[PDB]
Amino acid sequence: AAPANAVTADDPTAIALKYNQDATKSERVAAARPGLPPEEQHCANCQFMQANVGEGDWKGCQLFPGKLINVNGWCASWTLKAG
């Protein structure tokens, strides 16, 4: 059960960015974003994930202010995490 402020799939930013809460159900292979082989990409290894927002598997994303993503998710703005 998702948190009350989870990003929903038909949010227009979720549509534009092809966000999915489950990276295995995402377009990561198609997008081929640089930094890691596509099958390795998910929110937890993305620079925009906020480790200090949310709890557990439901964490912040700088691109979805006020909402929570799933650490196991993905979107087309996936960017290799610096830390």
Q: Which residues are annotated binding-site positions for [4Fe-4S] cluster?
A: 43, 46, 61, 75
Task: Work out how close the CB of 58 gets to ligand SF4 at its nearest, in angstroms, rounded to a whole number.
Answer: 12
3-state secondary structure the chain: CCCCCECCCCCHHHHHCCCECCHHHCCHHHHCCCCCCHHHCCHHHECCEEEEEEECCEEEECCCCCCEEECCCECCCCCECCC
Residue 57 sits in the site that holds ligand SF4 (CB under 6 A): no
Does position 33 interact with ligand SF4 (CB under 6 A)? The reply is no
Q: Is 43 in the site for ligand SF4 (CB under 6 A)?
A: yes
Asked if 73 interacts with ligand SF4 (CB under 6 A), we say: yes
